[PDB]
Structure 1
Amino acid sequence: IKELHVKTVKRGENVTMECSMSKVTNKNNLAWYRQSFGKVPQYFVRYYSSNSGYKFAEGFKDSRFSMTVNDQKFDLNIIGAREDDGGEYFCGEVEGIIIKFTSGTRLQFEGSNEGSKSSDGEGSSC
């Protein structure tokens, strides 16, 4: 039962969550579904017989997101990396009346450590 790839960084980066293709099946039932923290996972963007090769869910505005898709890949990408990006991401192919997430990813941002003037202290990592 596979582990969610854990991947920390911070504001401005760019980050790539790699789902494979690769033992994948009916492309058209292939997805990502974004899960922000404490919410319920929604479908987010799907594969799409075209050049780029995807389409984001209708409910959805953000130039920052895209994917490299081709025969091997089905990766999301984000340019610069805000923080409410913070979430889990699973990529799954609905097949049957079941979806079998063949991967996804946790991306948690800052850590943190941000230029001394305002606030509490004590590091850390207690």
Structure 2
Amino acid sequence: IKELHVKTVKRGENVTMECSMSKVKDKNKLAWYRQSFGKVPQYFVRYYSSNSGYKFAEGFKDSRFSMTVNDQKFDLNIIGTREDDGGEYFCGEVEGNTIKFTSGTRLQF
């Protein structure tokens, strides 16, 4: 049972939340999930074969968010963190009938 990284930030800081490509078997099934307090997690960005390597859920628009995607890394970034970024972020690969979460971060203020 895998432990979350804890990132304590202040408003205006930058953050990168890590996820490894190392055991991934289908990058098309990799996505990042966000869970805010009192809500269900939600997928907000996934792998996308392209030069950037990712793509955002429909009508997720926040320019502060990006990703750094390559054969090692599937890393999620926030430039200019605000109190409302607070919550948990999980990186998950879908496999058959279930998803496996291989890492996640609790982002806190």
Measure the CA separation in 2 of the matches of 1:80 and 1:36: 18
More RCO (CA 8 Å, sep 6+): 2
1:90 Cα deviation (Å)? 0.4
What is the SS of the residue equivalent to 2:8? coil
More strand by share: 2
Q: % of aligned pairs identical?
A: 94
- Displaced runs of 4 or more, over 6 A: none
1:27 Cα deviation (Å)? 0.3
User: For the pair shown, which has the larger CA radius of gyration, 1 or 2?
Assistant: 1
1:59 Cα deviation (Å)? 2.5
Q: What TM-score results when the alignment is normalised by the length of structure 2?
A: 0.98
Measure the CA separation in 2 of the matches of 1:90 and 1:100: 10
Measure the CA separation in 1 of the matches of 2:18 and 2:39: 22
Alignment: residue pair count: 109
Offset from partner CA, 1:40-88 (integer Å, 9 cap, x none):
1000100000001000110211000000000100000001001110010
Q: What 5-or-longer segments of structure 2 have no aligned partner?
A: none
1:38 Cα deviation (Å)? 1.1
CA RMSD of aligned residues (A): 0.6
